[PDB]
Each structure stands twice: as C-alpha cells, then as structure tokens.
C-alpha cells in the first residue's frame, strides 16, 4: 500500500518533534534548581515503539531518567536536606546537543521521503 | 432522483466533502498562532456515509503536545493531512473525469 506512507511519515515527524521538544526542554532546564513544589528538575526521555509486522514509530511515553542527582552543597538554602546537600538536575550538555542534530536530520530525511512518495503517487495518478 | 445522477452522486458528494475538509484544514493552518484555538476536522468516512443516505458537525482534534498559550493546532500532523487530502481530491477528480469521458464516448 502506497497510501500508508503518509501516516508512516506523519508518525515519524511527530515522534521526532516530540524528541526535539524534550531535548530543548532539558537544555532549558539544565540549571533549574527547583520545580513548583520543591521537586528538583529531572531529565526526561521519550520511548519509541513500532506501530505494528512493522510500521511507523510512536512515542509510547515520556519517562524521567533514573540517574542519581548531581547534588551540590549549599547549606544556607531552604531546600537543603539534613546534611545541606541540595539536589540538581542530572542533565549533561553533549547529549542534548547531539539529540537535537540527530532529530533534525531524521525529520528532514522523513520530509524528503514524503516528498518523493507524494511525487510518485501524483505521477501514478495519471497512468496512460 | 434520475438514472444519470444516481451514478455520480457518490463522487459529487465525495468531492464536496473533500473541498469542505480542505477548507477547514486551511482555516486551522491560517489560525496556527492565535492562542486558545482548537484544531477542527471532519470524520470523513462517517460523514460521507451519512450524506449518501438522504450542517456537517465538527470534531475537535486531540492535542499532540501541550502548549502554554492554549493553542492546540499541531503543524506536522495537519500538514500531512492537508497533503493527503489534496491527493485524494485529485484522485476523485480524475475518477469522475474518467467516468464522464466514458459516458460521452459511449454516445459517439
């Protein structure tokens, strides 16, 4: 089926957009010290899966990465624990700087796939 | 109705529904930045089946990811919808054209 390409590439576009938004949010919150209720910011990631044989890619869910918080010592802070160690986001920088580029490249590649498929479908529309 | 309109009523209604759906898609493209807007779309299959019995109701599109301003019109999903809708509109156009050309050619 050549119609399924549209909702395969749309799924790919949506998944890559979600991944790029997650990476941008992590980069923005790379240094945020607290949330709305004292909960430290946690790096988040998306889960990709196949639609199903094989099909498009769907984002199953968004999960906070389970890594120890890079806690720092600020005793004169209300959020400090009993030992004065406040918790900071466990977000690197190279990871997101590469995730953005990879997501953009995949997005552009799927755009090219959709363009080619649409062109050949329109060409087939005038058989004979 | 009549024996002539009986054959082409389905294709005419499909074309009209395609035009209305494309109009709604263009509307929610043009309102991509107005905050508090909700993307609208037509359940094409159900509406076509209902029309081919005898305005058109609007179904809100589920938001992809949340945004602060309240706008809920996505971009990639609606762009793919617009492209495929135009493609199927052209398909219906050429099918109806082929039917009419065959009918005319029979009468020569």
């Amino acid at each position: 089926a050549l119609l399924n390409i549209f909702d395969i590439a749309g799924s790919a576009l949506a998944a890559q957009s979600k991944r790029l938004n997650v990476a941008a949010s992590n980069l923005a919150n790379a240094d945020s010290v607290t949330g709305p209720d004292g909960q430290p910011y946690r790096a988040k990631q998306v889960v990709f899966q196949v639609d199903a044989a094989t099909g498009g890619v769907k984002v199953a869910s968004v999960i906070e990465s389970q890594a120890p918080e890079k806690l720092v010592y600020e005793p004169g802070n209300p959020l400090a624990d009993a030992n004065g160690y406040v918790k900071m986001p466990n977000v690197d920088v190279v990871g997101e700087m590469v995730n953005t580029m990879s997501a953009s490249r995949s997005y552009q590649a799927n755009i090219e796939v959709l363009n080619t498929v649409k062109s050949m479908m329109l060409k087939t529309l005038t058989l004979g | 109705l009549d024996r002539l309109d009986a054959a082409l009523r389905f294709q005419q209604e499909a074309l009209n529904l395609r035009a209305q759906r494309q109009e709604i898609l263009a509307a929610n493209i043009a309102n991509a930045d107005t905050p508090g807007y909700q993307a609208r779309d037509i359940d094409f299959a159900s509406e076509l089946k209902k029309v081919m019995v005898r305005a058109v109701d609007l179904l809100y599109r589920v938001p992809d990811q949340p945004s602060l301003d309240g706008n809920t019109v996505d971009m990639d999903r609606e762009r793919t919808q617009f492209a495929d809708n135009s493609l199927k509109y052209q398909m219906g156009l050429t099918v109806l054209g082929s039917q009419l050309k065959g009918m005319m050619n029979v009468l020569q």
């Binding site: 709305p36 209720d37 | 179904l59 589920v62 938001p63 602060l68």
Partner: peptide, 21 residues
C-alpha cells in the same frame, strides 16, 4: 484518547502555574 485521533470533547485549557497554592 490516542494522540492525533478525533474526539468530540474539546481539550481542557493548559495552564502553567509558577507555584502550587
């Protein structure tokens, strides 16, 4: 329910409070 599908119920407004009251 699934994102990208059609539902007749409009989504509730999205809000981002700075601090929980």
């Amino acid at each position: 329910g699934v994102p990208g599908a059609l539902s007749n119920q409009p989504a509730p407004p999205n809000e981002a409070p700075i601090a929980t009251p």
